Design a protein around this ligand. Structure first.
Ligand SMILES: *[C@@H]1O[C@H](CO)[C@@H](O[C@@H]2O[C@H](CO)[C@@H](O[C@@H]3O[C@H](CO)[C@@H](O)[C@H](O)[C@@H]3O)[C@H](O)[C@H]2NC(C)=O)[C@H](O)[C@H]1NC(C)=O
Ligand SMILES: *[C@@H]1O[C@H](CO)[C@@H](O[C@@H]2O[C@H](CO)[C@@H](O)[C@H](O)[C@H]2NC(C)=O)[C@H](O)[C@H]1NC(C)=O
Ligand code: NAG
Ligand code: NAG
Ligand code: NAG
Ligand code: NAG
Ligand code: NAG
Ligand code: NAG
Lengths: 108, 173, 53, 173, 173
C-alpha cells in the first residue's frame, strides 16, 4: 500500500573539509574560501601600469644612471617593481643614508 | 543527526534528486518518485547567502602596502616587524580556522534542524490518521494521490478526509 | 615575468584575484588584497554529507 | 523555530502579556487570559545576565594613552604605527562583530529551546488525557479550573483526576 | 537539558556506573543493574579527541625570543613595544576565553544531544509495545530478560515478539 517518505540530496561528490568532530569530512557541495593560486604574472592595477626598474637600483632610478631609462613620462603608477638582487647600484660608490626612509616615502 | 535524523534515525543520503537539497519521496499506486521542498530549501539557501555575505564583507581590505626592508643597525625594528606581522598573521589564521570549523558545525546543525522541523510538520498533520514506520517514513492506513502529495507538501491535509479509513484500517491491527 | 594583464592586488608569485578574502600564498601584497595565513586550505560547507548505499 | 516552534509550528507573537517573556494562555469557562512563566523565564534571564557580565568583563581597559605623533624622518614608524593600530582595530572589530552575530543566534536558539522544552513539559503530563490541536495548544477531553491551571504550571496534574473523563470523551471520536 | 533531558525531564546524575559516560539501567526479575553504552560513548569521545587535537595544534609555537630592552631616548619604541605586546596578549586572551566558554557550551550541548538521540532510539523500537513513564524510563507491558536488554542496546527488538502481550496488558488500562 502507499507510503510517504522524507528526502534530501546526495551526489557523486567527494570534496571535503576538516571539522571539530570529524576529519576529511565529505559533502555534496562546498565552497573554497581561499585563493591558493597565483597567476605567475606581473599584471598591473586597474589599467594603471607599474614602475619597472628592470635591472636598476632605486639609486640608479632616482639619480639618472643612463642605463636606467629615466622615464619622465612615468608620472604616477600602481606599484614599484624590483628584483631582489639589483644590478645597477651607483657607478661611483658612496654611503647613501636613510635608504629606508626614502623608500617608505616613495612607497606611494 | 545531532538532533536525531542524519546518521540519526536516518542512515544515508539519496543521489536521485538534484533540484534542491530537501524534499519528499512519494510512493503510491501511480508509482514512485522524488520531489524537492523548494520552500524551506530556498529559505535555508537565503540564509546561507546571508552568511557568506556576512563573512566576506566583514573584512575591510585597504589599498595596502605590506613590505618594508631595513639595514642591520635597526634590528630592534627588524625582529619587531617580524614579531608584529607574524603575530597578526597568526591571529587572523587562528580566528579564521576556528570560524570555518564552527560555522560549518552550525551549518550542519542548521540543515539537521530544518529536516527535523519538517519531520514534525509532516507528522503534525497525519497524527492518528497514519503511522510511524521504521525510520524516515510514514505509512498510511488509507490511499493518497498526487493531489494528496502536493497538498501535504504545502501544509494542507483536511484531517477528516481519510479519518475514517484510518479509523477502520487501524483496527485490524 | 611582466605582462599587459590587469589585476586588483599583486605579489611576486603572481598577480592575484581580489574576489576572495584570504590567501595562504605569500604575505607581501600591494593593492585591494586578500589576507595571509599560515594554513593549507579553508573550505566552508555549502551543502552537506554524501552517502549512497 | 530552529527547533520547531517560532515561525515553526507557531507563527506569531502576542502583545497582550508583558510581565515576562514566556507563559501560557488559559481558556476555560470562567473566561480567557494570559499568565507568564516566571520560573523558567527568570532562569533564562539569569542566564542572560551571566552572558553580558561575561562579555563586558572579559575586556580589561587600561588607563590608556592612545596617541603618538612624529616628524617626517620616522616614516618607517609612522606607517608602522598606522599599520599596527589599524591591525588591532580591525581585529577587535571583526571578533566583536562575529561575536554579536553568533551570540544573538545562540540567544534566539536559547529562547527557542526553552519554549520547546516547556512544550514537552506540558505535553509530558497530559499525554493520553488530552490532545494536540492545530499548533501552539492542547484541547482537553475534560474541564479545567484556575486551580488546574496553576497546578499544571508548576509541574503537577494528578493523572488519574480526569483520566476517565478523557477515556470516555475520547470515545465519541 | 538544553534539548530537554539533563536538568530537563531528567533531574540528576548517577554515580554508580563509571565504565563510560552513557548507558542504560536494566530492571527485571533477575534484578537491577547499570550498563554503559560504549558505542555512542566511544564515538562521542572520539569527537572530543578530535576537538582537543584541533585546538592545541592550531597554534604554531615558534622557537621564540620574547624580550627586548631599551634606553630612555627610545621611548617611542618602549611605549610602542608595551602597546604591541599588551595588544597581542589581550587578543589571545580574549579569543581563548571566549573559546573555552563556547566550546564548553557546545560540549554540553553535544552530550545533551547524544542522550536525547538515544532516548529517541530506545523509543523508536518500543513505541506501542511499551509506555513512557515519569521521566527517564519506559515501563513494559511484558517481560524482558538479559537477552532482551543486550538486544535492545544494539538496536534490535523484534517488534512482534511481545506485541500481543502488550496488546492485552494495555487493555486493562
Ligand atoms: C650596470 O650593471 C652592469 C651589470 O652588472 C654593469 O656591467 C658589469 O660591471 C662589472 C663590474 O665589475 C663588469 O666587470 C668588470 O669588467 C671590467 C672590464 O670592463 C674590469 O675592469 C673589471 O675588473 C670587472 O671585471 C662586467 O663585465 C660588466 N658587465 C656588463 C655586461 O656590462 C654595469 O657596469 C653597470 N652600469 C652602471 C652605469 O651602473
Ligand atoms: C640585466 O642584466 C642581465 C645580466 O644577466 C643583462 O643580460 C645581458 O644582455 C645582453 C644583451 O642585451 C647580452 O649581450 C649579455 O650577454 C647579457 N648578460 C647576461 C649575464 O645574461 C640584461 O641585458 C640586463 N638588462 C638591463 C635592462 O639592463
Ligand atoms: C561528479 O558529477 C559532476 C556533475 O555531473 C561532475 O562534474 C564530476 O566530474 C563527477 N565526478 C565523477 C568522479 O564522476
Ligand atoms: C578520513 O580520516 C579517517 C580517519 O580514521 C579515515 O578512516 C578515512 O579513510 C579518511 N578518508 C580520507 C578520504 O582520507
Ligand atoms: C496546496 O496544494 C493544493 C493541491 O495539492 C493546491 O490546490 C493549493 O492551491 C496549494 N496551496 C498553496 C498555498 O500553495
Ligand atoms: C577571479 O575569481 C572569481 C571568483 O573565484 C572568478 O569568478 C573569476 O573568474 C576569477 N578571475 C580570474 C582571472 O582568476
Ligand atoms: C502548585 O500549584 C498548586 C495549585 O495549583 C499549589 O497548591 C501548590 O502549592 C503548587 N506547588 C508548588 C511547588 O508551587
Ligand atoms: C545484538 O544483541 C543480540 C543479543 O542481545 C546478539 O545476539 C546480536 O549478535 C547483537 N548484534 C550486534 C550487531 O551486535
Amino acid at each position: 500500500e502507499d507510503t510517504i517518505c522524507i528526502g534530501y540530496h546526495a551526489n557523486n561528490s567527494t570534496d571535503t573539509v576538516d571539522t571539530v568532530l570529524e576529519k576529511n569530512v565529505t559533502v555534496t557541495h562546498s565552497v573554497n574560501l581561499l585563493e591558493d593560486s597565483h597567476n605567475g604574472k606581473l599584471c598591473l592595477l586597474k589599467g594603471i601600469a607599474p614602475l619597472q626598474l628592470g635591472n636598476c637600483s632605486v639609486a640608479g632610478w632616482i639619480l639618472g644612471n643612463p642605463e636606467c631609462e629615466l622615464l619622465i613620462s612615468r608620472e604616477s603608477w600602481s606599484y614599484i617593481v624590483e628584483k631582489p638582487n639589483p644590478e645597477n647600484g651607483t657607478c661611483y660608490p658612496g654611503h647613501f643614508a636613510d635608504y629606508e626612509e626614502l623608500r617608505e616615502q616613495l612607497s606611494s | 543527526g545531532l538532533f536525531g535524523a542524519i546518521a540519526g534515525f536516518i542512515e544515508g543520503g539519496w543521489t536521485g534528486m538534484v533540484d534542491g537539497w530537501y524534499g519528499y519521496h512519494h510512493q503510491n499506486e501511480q508509482g514512485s518518485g522524488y520531489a524537492a521542498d523548494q520552500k524551506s530549501t530556498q529559505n535555508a539557501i537565503n540564509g546561507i547567502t546571508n552568511k557568506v555575505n556576512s563573512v566576506i564583507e566583514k573584512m575591510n581590505t585597504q589599498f595596502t602596502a605590506v613590505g618594508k626592508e631595513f639595514n642591520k643597525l635597526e634590528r630592534r625594528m627588524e625582529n619587531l616587524n617580524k614579531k608584529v606581522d607574524d603575530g597578526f598573521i597568526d591571529i587572523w589564521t587562528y580566528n579564521a580556522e576556528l570560524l570555518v570549523l564552527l560555522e560549518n558545525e552550525r551549518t550542519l546543525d542548521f540543515h539537521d534542524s530544518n529536516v527535523k522541523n519538517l519531520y514534525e510538520k509532516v507528522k503534525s498533520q497525519l497524527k492518528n490518521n497514519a503511522k510511524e514506520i521504521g525510520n524516515g517514513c510514514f505509512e498510511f492506513y488509507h490511499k493518497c494521490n498526487d493531489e494528496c502529495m502536493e497538498s501535504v507538501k504545502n501544509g494542507t491535509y483536511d484531517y477528516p478526509k481519510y479519518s475514517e479509513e484510518s479509523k477502520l484500517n487501524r483496527e485490524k491491527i | 615575468p611582466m605582462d599587459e594583464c590587469d589585476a586588483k592586488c599583486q605579489t611576486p608569485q603572481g598577480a592575484i584575484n581580489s574576489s576572495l578574502p584570504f590567501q595562504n600564498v605569500h604575505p607581501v601584497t600591494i593593492g585591494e588584497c586578500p589576507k595571509y595565513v599560515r594554513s593549507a586550505k579553508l573550505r566552508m560547507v555549502t551543502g552537506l554529507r554524501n552517502i549512497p548505499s
